[PDB]
Amino acid sequence: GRIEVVNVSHIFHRGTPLEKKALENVSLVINEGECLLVAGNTGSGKSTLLQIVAGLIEPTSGDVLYDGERKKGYEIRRNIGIAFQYPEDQFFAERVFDEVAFAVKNFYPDRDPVPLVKKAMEFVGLDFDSFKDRVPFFLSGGEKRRVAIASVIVHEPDILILDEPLVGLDREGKTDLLRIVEKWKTLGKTVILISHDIETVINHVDRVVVLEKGKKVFDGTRMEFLEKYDPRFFTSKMLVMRRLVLKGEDPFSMSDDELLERVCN
Amino acid sequence: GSGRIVSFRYNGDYVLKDVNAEFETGKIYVVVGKNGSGKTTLLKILAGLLAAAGEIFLDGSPADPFLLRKNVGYVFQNPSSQIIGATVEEDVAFSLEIMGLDESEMRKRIKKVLELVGLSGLAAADPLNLSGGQKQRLAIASMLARDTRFLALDEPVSMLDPPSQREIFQVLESLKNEGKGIILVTHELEYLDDMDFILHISNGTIDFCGSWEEFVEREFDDVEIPFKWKLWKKCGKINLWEDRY
Numbered sequence: 001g002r003i004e005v006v007n008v009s010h011i012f013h014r015g016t017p018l019e020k021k022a023l024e025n026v027s028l029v030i031n032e033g034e035c036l037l038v039a040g041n042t043g044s045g046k047s048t049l050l051q052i053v054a055g056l057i058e059p060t061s062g063d064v065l066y067d068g069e070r071k072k073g074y075e076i077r078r079n080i081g082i083a084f085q086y087p088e089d090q091f092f093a094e095r096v097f098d099e100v101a102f103a104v105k106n107f108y109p110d111r112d113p114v115p116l117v118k119k120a121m122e123f124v125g126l127d128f129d130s131f132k133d134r135v136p137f138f139l140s141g142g143e144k145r146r147v148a149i150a151s152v153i154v155h156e157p158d159i160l161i162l163d164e165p166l167v168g169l170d171r172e173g174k175t176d177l178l179r180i181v182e183k184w185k186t187l188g189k190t191v192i193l194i195s196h197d198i199e200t201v202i203n204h205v206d207r208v209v210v211l212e213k214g215k216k217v218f219d220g221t222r223m224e225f226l227e228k229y230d231p232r233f234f235t236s237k238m239l240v241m242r243r244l245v246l247k248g249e250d251p252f253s254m255s256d257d258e259l260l261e262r263v264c265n
Numbered sequence: 266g267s268g269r270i271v272s273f274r275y276n277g278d279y280v281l282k283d284v285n286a287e288f289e290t291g292k293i294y295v296v297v298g299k300n301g302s303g304k305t306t307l308l309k310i311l312a313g314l315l316a317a318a319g320e321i322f323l324d325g326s327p328a329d330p331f332l333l334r335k336n337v338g339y340v341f342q343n344p345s346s347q348i349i350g351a352t353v354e355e356d357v358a359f360s361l362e363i364m365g366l367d368e369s370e371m372r373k374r375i376k377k378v379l380e381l382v383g384l385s386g387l388a389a390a391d392p393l394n395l396s397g398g399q400k401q402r403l404a405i406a407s408m409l410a411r412d413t414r415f416l417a418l419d420e421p422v423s424m425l426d427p428p429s430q431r432e433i434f435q436v437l438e439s440l441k442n443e444g445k446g447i448i449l450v451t452h453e454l455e456y457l458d459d460m461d462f463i464l465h466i467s468n469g470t471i472d473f474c475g476s477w478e479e480f481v482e483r484e485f486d487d488v489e490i491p492f493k494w495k496l497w498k499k500c501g502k503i504n505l506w507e508d509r510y
């Protein structure tokens with residue numbers, strides 16, 4: 001339910017000339033029901049960090065505490081669903097059903113997976129009869145992203161990780177997918193988002209952590225982020241939100257049009 | 266050199282009907298329109314990867330798909346389905362072998378083109394083991410090396426970090442300043458500061474081609490107006506990406 005990362009670092013291929021320090025001594029806390037944004041450039045270690053938290057990687061150093069205590073891979077993975085940034089790294093099945101039903105047949109092998117898959121697919125807005133037999137390879141990116149999500153929330157985990165789920169989507173498809181996120185956290189479950197699209201994602205999170213070259217260079221709330229973080233490369237919309245914040249207003253939960261009438265007046 | 270440049274059905278219905286458009290070197294064109302409106306189809310036609318029915322000119326002369334592939338560089342939406350090579354430098358060198366051959370120049374050229382996209386140092390790498398965003402940089406590199414006058418880019422930087430996105434767009438902004446025609450569809454209009462015309466696709470045709478100013482005033486409801494443009498309308502052209510320093 002609650003996650004604590006304590007000074008973990010990570011090395012790929014120690015000793016050998018292709019040695020890569022992915023992470024360096026990073027620590028943070030994710031409370032239960034928290035909604036966290038993990039930002040930072042490509043190669044900052046975002047994907048690796050959340051893989052370690054999900055129990056797919058054994059950190060070279062440090063530990064991660066789950067409700068206070070260390071655990072092993074298997075225990076972590078039952079309660080932590082992670083959707084990769086490239087959904088073809090998840091796919092292995094020739095039907096959507098088999099792709100989704102996997103975690104059930106791996107964790108709860110006696111449960112009839114049918115009505116489980118049926119509602120996980122429904123949760124993400126995929127008609128069951130329309131999609132259960134479709135070949136994942138030939139889905140649209142938006143459809144692939146939905147299947148990837150349904151296949152990791154199907155075993156009802158308490159934590160959901162989405163590594164860059166809005167890449168290659170429309171303003172439509174992005175909106176409809178954040179709608180799925182809001183649902184998740186209405187069930188009181190925690191969800192971590194890795195994203196570069198801060199101005200769109202920030203209205204849906206509580207805290208913002210920023211990685212850089214393996215190190216955590218920011219941790220704080222979204223209000224703190226706007227007001228404290230280096231705004232040198234904020235988008236135009238982020239600069240307006242920041243303005244409003246510095247005038248003691250609440251730019252979140254406010255339209256783009258409403259944002260604009262309150263500036264440059 | 267200078268340069269200047271309809272209907273289409275796949276196999277069932279007509280997706281593009283009565284398309285009137287014009288592109289010149291030295292300008293940047295952005296094609297907008299909702300999903301399945303025809304943007305990708307329209308760009309392939311320009312590239313010569315789709316054969317369309319109608320009248321297409323290249324410097325006055327009629328233009329067959331072929332002649333288009335001669336003069337229009339392309340980047341797919343999915344950069345994987347574009348490259349075949351053992352190494353990174355092999356996928357690039359592919360595009361220049363008609364170019365004289367000549368080698369001391371290729372190795373000097375490929376050098377240049379990898380630098381632009383940020384793949385310098387990975388010349389010997391294996392494309393099958395590159396990341397998605399890396400493949401995109403490679404797709405752009407094998408296209409830039411053909412040295413065409415027109416570049417067609419269908420969402421070329423969708424999986425790059427914001428700084429790399431700006432760096433690519435800025436490369437495109439300097440190619441335009443050197444007599445390239447850039448036709449581009451993108452969701453990352455935030456990071457593109459310089460551009461000439463926006464084309465809106467609706468109902469299987471182009472119902473708009475003008476400035477971003479004219480586009481804002483338009484108020485289309487099928488597409489999003491970039492937040493940056495409304496800010497420009499209200500506050501002025503401030504905070505340009507060149508002036509962040």
Ligand SMILES: Nc1ncnc2c1ncn2[C@@H]1O[C@H](COP(=O)(O)OP(=O)(O)O)[C@@H](O)[C@H]1O
Pocket residue numbers: 012020021022040041042043044045046047048049
């Ligand atoms: N299996 C691996 N072997 C060698 N280097 C790796 C491996 N996995 C990741 N890396 C390196 O770790 C760094 C961080 O990558 P990643 O964790 O994907 O962060 P991000 O997703 O933010 O780019 C990158 O520079 C990458 O080259």
Ligand SMILES: Nc1ncnc2c1ncn2[C@@H]1O[C@H](COP(=O)(O)OP(=O)(O)O)[C@@H](O)[C@H]1O
Pocket residue numbers: 275276280298299300301302303304305306307
């Ligand atoms: N290979 C294909 N075969 C049949 N129809 C296609 C193919 N590719 C695209 N279409 C159709 O053409 C229309 C527009 O395609 P496209 O240019 O990809 O849309 P967009 O401009 O949104 O990318 C869509 O309605 C789609 O159904």
